[PDB]
Amino acid sequence: QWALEDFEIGRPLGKGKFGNVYLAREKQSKFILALKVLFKAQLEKAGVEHQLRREVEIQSHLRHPNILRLYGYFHDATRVYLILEYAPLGTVYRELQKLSKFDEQRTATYITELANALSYCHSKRVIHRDIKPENLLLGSAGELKIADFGWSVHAPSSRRDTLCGTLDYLPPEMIEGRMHDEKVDLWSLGVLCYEFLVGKPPFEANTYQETYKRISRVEFTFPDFVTEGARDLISRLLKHNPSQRPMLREVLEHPWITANSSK
Ligand SMILES: Clc1ccccc1Nc1ccnc(Nc2ccc(-c3nnn[nH]3)cc2)n1
DSSP conformation class of 143: -
Q: Is 206 helix (H, G, I), strand (E, B) or coil?
A: coil
Q: Ligand 1 centroid to 43 CA: how many Å?
A: 21
Q: Do domains 2-90 and 91-263 have the same CATH topology?
A: no
DSSP H helices in the chain: 41-45, 50-53, 56-61, 92-99, 104-123, 172-175, 184-198, 208-216, 228-237, 248-253, 255-260
Q: Ligand 1 centroid to 89 CA: how many Å?
A: 8
Q: Give the residue whose CA is nearest to atom 19 of ligand 1.
A: 90
d(CA 185, CA 122): 10
- Evaluate the CA torsion angle 240, 165, 251, 236 in order and state its sign: positive
CB of 90 within 8 A of CB of 155?
yes
Q: Ligand 1 centroid to 155 CA: how many Å?
A: 6
Cβ partners under 8 Å of residue 92, min gap 6:
110, 133, 136, 137, 138, 144
**Which of 79, 92, 73, 156 lies closest to 130, judged by CA?**
92
Topology of domain 91-263 in CATH is: Transferase(Phosphotransferase); domain 1 (1.10.510)
d(CA 231, CA 32): 41
DSSP per-residue string spanning 240-252: SSGGGSPPHHHHH
Residue 136: C-alpha distances to residues 115, 181, 208, 234 (Å): 13, 22, 24, 19
Q: Is 136 helix (H, G, I), strand (E, B) or coil?
A: strand
d(CA 197, CA 226): 7
d(CA 68, CA 84): 7
Ligand 1 lined by 96 (C-beta under 6 Å)? no
- Method of determination is X-ray
d(CA 236, CA 128): 19
Annotated binding site for ATP: 17, 36, 85-87, 134-135, 148
Strands 32-38 and 80-84, by their bridges, are antiparallel
CB of 24 within 8 A of CB of 32?
yes
Q: Give the residue whose CA is nearest to atom 15 of ligand 1.
A: 90
Query: Inter-axis angle of helices 184-198 and 228-237, to 10 degrees?
Result: 150
This PDB structure is determined at a resolution in Å of 2.4
| Sequence letter at residue 20 | N
Q: Ligand 1 centroid to 237 CA: how many Å?
A: 28
d(CA 194, CA 2): 42
d(CA 217, CA 171): 10
CB of 124 within 8 A of CB of 61?
yes
How distant is the alpha carbon of residue 85 from its chain centre? 15
d(CA 22, CA 35): 5
Residue range 2-90 forms a domain whose CATH class is: alpha beta
CB of 189 within 8 A of CB of 237?
yes
Q: Give the residue whose CA is nearest to atom 6 of ligand 1.
A: 14
Cβ partners under 8 Å of residue 244, min gap 6:
236
| Residue 261 φ/ψ region, left for φ over 0, alpha for ψ in the -120 to 50 degree band, beta for the rest | beta
Helix/strand/coil percent split, the chain, to 5: 40, 20, 40
Mutate to test the pocket of ligand 1, among 13, 69, 73 (most ligand atoms within 8 A of CB): 13
Residue 261: C-alpha distances to residues 103, 189, 233, 258 (Å): 10, 15, 14, 6
d(CA 94, CA 120): 26
d(CA 208, CA 146): 26
Domains of the chain by residue range: 2-90, 91-263
Residue 24: C-alpha distances to residues 5, 12, 59, 193 (Å): 11, 9, 20, 33
Q: Which residues are catalytic?
A: 130
